[model samples]
Target chain A: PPHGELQYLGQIQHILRCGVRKDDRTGTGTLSVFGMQARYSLRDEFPLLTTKRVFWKGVLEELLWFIKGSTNAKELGVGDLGPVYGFQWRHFGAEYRDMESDYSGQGVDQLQRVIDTIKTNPDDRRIIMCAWNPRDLPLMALPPCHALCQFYVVNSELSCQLYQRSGDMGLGVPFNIASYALLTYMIAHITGLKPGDFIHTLGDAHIYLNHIEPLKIQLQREPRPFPKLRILRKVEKIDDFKAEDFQIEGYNPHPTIKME
Target chain B: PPHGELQYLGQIQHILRCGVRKDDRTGTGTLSVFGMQARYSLRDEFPLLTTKRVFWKGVLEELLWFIKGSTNAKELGVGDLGPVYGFQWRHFGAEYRDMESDYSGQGVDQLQRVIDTIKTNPDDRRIIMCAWNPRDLPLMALPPCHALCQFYVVNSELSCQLYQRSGDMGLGVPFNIASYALLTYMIAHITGLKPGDFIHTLGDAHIYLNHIEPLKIQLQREPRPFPKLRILRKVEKIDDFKAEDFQIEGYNPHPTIKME
Candidate 1:
């Protein structure tokens, strides 16, 4: 637990392994995804990931996508990151024949536009990204993995709360956590509002029956306090963000368990 | 105007009438549902609903079932709410069901358990429910009208926040408002918590392209003044509440539009 202000990170690890149990509805086996309430007093510090490997690229892209209010996965450039949504909204609805047509695509830029809107109009209640496209569900390679919706900035703080109708604990949690945190940071960076809190209020939050063993092992290991996440550059424009634009300050973890 | 506290009730009337287009995956037509938040502070004088005919019995039984943490619709048998979750979990699994039944079947009673747990032990963080069951999805007949899941509680004064996944402005909104507000009252009564604020957060909140016209008409109608919701008796037990124990006061509405 060497992480900094996130010294309470151990609670999350404990929560996942013991605090959460397999729910009958959303969970297959016997595990539940952990829901966390990390209260960072804006007057004190900001919450960024430093514990493990958080793909900042994915975070930036996901934030941009939400800001854009886009639901398709292909738009974000589908990859092994496990079915990120933008990829499908862009390419899945329409197949791609070109080998190299920006496999990641243009939706990321639109996502940037969304970020811009939130920064400028923090008071707008409509600052929402909705994925639930009835028309595209059939065409999606994997019907929006994190399908359809998130609310931004409640109570003056740049807080993002996600209603994951279904959550895959082992794989999805880490990414979801990092993704929203990054989104908060990005928005706060532009809006001048500090990150308030990241609330993951899940519906069908569950661990795949198959992933139990891996979870147990990970739980056996200590949650090396959460490391702080840092965006490398201070850019006003979303487009100004690139792969190198993000940097994580402190993250040390045990080996990854290969499980779906 | 009656039911002035409501911002999106009439819209719901249309959805139930017109129905929803089927979402291909679950073959369940999506239904939008929005819940209401009435701060007791606001309810001091104005009746939240004074015009519409409210089904107090249905609302009570539903809230009881949620507090009891029962997922089986059979639990709601007495009041004719008829096969809501139990039917969906066992038979339909079509609309609200999914590929995995793991995280899908968490019962309604989990809400109280969450409130109880949070208040009793903030250190133990295992408060959640499974609304998205995969195995149950295929069994659901009409699908889940409200794929929404929520955690309502008094944060400081007596505030309840609802996290609605997909809100169909046409049908679900009204019921949601009444349902949760009633629940909030019940929980507050039993727990001795003061009512504060109602924060309604929606994902994919939309008036179906087909539902727009009727909603506008409904909105123009003056809502009746607020109605007082009275608890039939002070129940020592939160889970044992009966339908006969709750009452609605001061409900007045101009006319119910039988829209489709």
Candidate 2:
């Protein structure tokens, strides 16, 4: 099979080659394509890109912050941004009144439910967590980009697929890939199963006009073997893992290209 | 490019060749693949498959039923299936109390909003109507299989992408392809734009074990040219059109395969 990083590079190449030149919300023009899909195997190695260095700090902090649903962190920085995933994952099925609605008061704990279902009915196709709440779109500044995810288990291997509505290829997509891959690993670890594949499906995938030149340089470099993600401890619960408990082994990537 | 129907046939072949054996909700065993995507062009032609006959009647009725959001028909047969799309599309952002709850009284009309955005701000990336309502999942019998769809407008053409969580490839998927494609056509007509592409992305795309033989037979046949969908009149509003307004011209397919 072709390497996962090659799939990412393939996506970039396709966009540049066949994408339509359309201007976006920010007025930065984009070479855009409507739909694209790529699958990254999580057999033993992680999918952190070898073409360019990705921000491990943001991926860790933002994910952990969402999992914790920390009130202090929200005030300190994270804010109701949890309303996007952390809020929805933890408090799905909760009735909403407005943008100020903190689902903390009531809702289905979908994160925990998914974990419970994995251990019990691993074949359940209904195992999904959706972040795109249409009710909240009116009150929010931005809609969910990494909108919804579904988990499937077969032969003790857990796989996850994310349907992202829009992606910024040069900037947001690499981080998005790493983050979801991490989420699948965490869930697999807790459920005592192996991580399978992380499938990333995109709608309106685009590369901003400004980021094109830098992306070409990044794409030219050969992708090294992906590093293995080592969970340092047997964290039995999803919420129990900390940043210190996870480690990336043998990560050698080309230098990061600053697009912004 | 290979014919669009070839993509569908390739999916069946891929699954038979490499799909994992997993049993699903109804105890029907399946050969399942994790994630898949195929795009069919809607440029001056419809994508009703020529490999096997599809249920055009159900496609027209179900789509129009959802669009009308009629209470009488909900009792007649369609039931609250409208709550799945019509309710969600026309009344998104409505506060949900329960499954039996009706938002007919209030909510953002996302369907209309999308049309407005397509005409006014064609570059907007957020034109979406989501059917996966986490808040109402508990009150419903089935979660949205066609969970969400995002629309994109570029170069005065409209395209749609559907994220379907679980698909019954032998049965449900054929209907799904035509329904969404027809939707793209209707939206394009109303907005005075050309139809672009109907991109279908699936999570657990599977063919039941019982469906294998018939599908194998289906693989052996050559796909004929897809037919053109003609809208009889220029409908100003989405709700104004009925089942009579649409026509599927020149759709000749192999006889239907019954797999019970």
Tell me the tens digit of each residue's lDDT in model 2 across B43-99: 877889989998888888888867865433443223333345666667655655554
Candidate 1 C-alpha error for residue B243, in Å? 11
Q: Candidate 2 chain B — worst ten consecutive residues by lDDT sum?
A: B71-80
True contacts kept of 1: 0.04
Clashing pairs in 2: A74-A79, A135-B93
The digit string of per-residue lDDT tens for model 1 on A1-260 reads 23333423444354455533433433234343322322333223334343334455566666666444344456575222222354443333344334334445433332443466566654333344433334434542222223433434534556555555445656776676667667667767766666765655443345666766666666555545455656677778543555566766555655656776
Chain A TM per candidate, in order of listing: 0.61, 0.89
RMSD of each: 15.5, 3.9
Question: Which docking category, incorrect, acceptable, medium or high, applies to candidate 2?
Answer: medium
Candidate 2 lDDT for residue B16: 95
- The most accurate candidate by TM-score is 2
Error of 2 at A91 (Å): 3.8
Give each model's whole-structure lDDT.
0.48, 0.83
lDDT at position B221, candidate 2? 92
